[PDB]
Design a protein around this ligand. Structure first.
Ligand SMILES: Nc1ncnc2c1ncn2[C@@H]1O[C@@H]2COP(=O)(O)O[C@H]3[C@H](O)[C@H](n4cnc5c(N)ncnc54)O[C@@H]3COP(=O)(O)O[C@H]2[C@@H]1O
Lengths: 179, 179
């Protein structure tokens, strides 16, 4: 173990609560400079990928070649715990359908899941691969419950959970099109 | 709960393992440009403050006015979990003795402790203030044990634990002078 409870709460307090209040204005700033009638605007919410037992690569294109990096948002800075101008950066991605762009949005993995699965490599961590699917689901359970009691944050992000045919770019496009 | 075990392991895997291998070269880069015989060079290790039951402000000067921000190190970047060029920044601080600079080093709090104590504010987190001193000590216990089995990381950082007369700038200067 039940290590997920701590990681889910850290993820919310130490990150989501910090960027989500300012995300909509950064997306607005980007769209105002780059949006025109020949293209779709960047979506308005943060899309968080939650692979429950898959890999968590750093390059999204290597999980699905139809997801490709497009641009960065404007940086967000803030002093935290003695670090001056700590940087919070996010990336914009395009979603391809039949070789053509069909969507764009701010996209990223839930990093603590990556940290959680990497405890694989250390015996003193007491985390075996047999527990990842269970702790990963609990992480999603805890985080789902937290944003239920925090509407202002729930409406600025969307969770996308999945396991291992199925296309990750299509799953993303499904959520974008229900908005 | 025993939430510290997860937070300590996340802190090591998701941060210390990432910056400590490259810290010595960034400090070298800074000293080479700004060091001269009229001043002391920036120390070579990362000094991590671990307040076990005190406050964790973002501005170190407000914990002790003899600790003042000096400069930033060169940024470190790296793609992580879909975020392109994720930024890892650190700050340099000067330590004052009788109104004169007596030391300089890279200094910061162990951020997860700040995240841990902020779970104060949420009932669904199940963390009461009566447990902070216990979980904080466990966090230090777990992290101390991890760097015992990781020498290469132990020699690039120094842990500084303390509770609530006593000067935080003097405690820091003590460690710098034993090096
Ligand atoms: N700028 C950012 N961009 C995207 N996501 C962010 C983020 N800052 C925090 N998060 C996410 O929130 C989790 C918990 O953050 P904490 O600050 O409480 O606890 C963090 C703590 O801040 C430290 N850490 C991580 N990145 C750091 C950085 N760039 N500078 C200083 N400390 C860092 O390591 C702990 C565990 O890291 P994780 O396993 O990655 O788990 C992180 C995860 O990276």
């Amino acid at each position: 173990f039940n290590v997920a409870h701590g990681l889910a709460w850290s993820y919310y307090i130490g990150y989501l609560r910090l960027i989500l209040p300012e995300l909509q204005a950064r997306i607005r700033t980007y769209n105002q400079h780059y949006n025109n009638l020949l293209r779709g605007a960047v979506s308005q919410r943060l899309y968080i990928l939650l692979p429950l037992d898959c890999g968590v690569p750093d390059n999204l294109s290597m999980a699905d070649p139809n997801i490709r990096f497009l641009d960065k948002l404007p940086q967000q800075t803030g002093d935290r715990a003695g670090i001056k101008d700590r940087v919070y950066s996010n990336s914009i991605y395009e979603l391809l359908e039949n070789g053509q762009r069909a969507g764009t949005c701010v996209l990223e993995y839930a990093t603590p899941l990556q940290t959680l699965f990497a405890m694989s490599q250390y015996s003193q961590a007491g985390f075996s691969r047999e527990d990842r699917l269970e702790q990963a689901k609990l992480f999603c359970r805890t985080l789902e419950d937290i944003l239920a009691d925090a509407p202002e944050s729930q409406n600025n992000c969307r969770l996308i959970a999945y396991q291992e045919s199925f296309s990750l770019s299509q799953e993303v496009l499904r959520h974008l099109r229900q908005e």
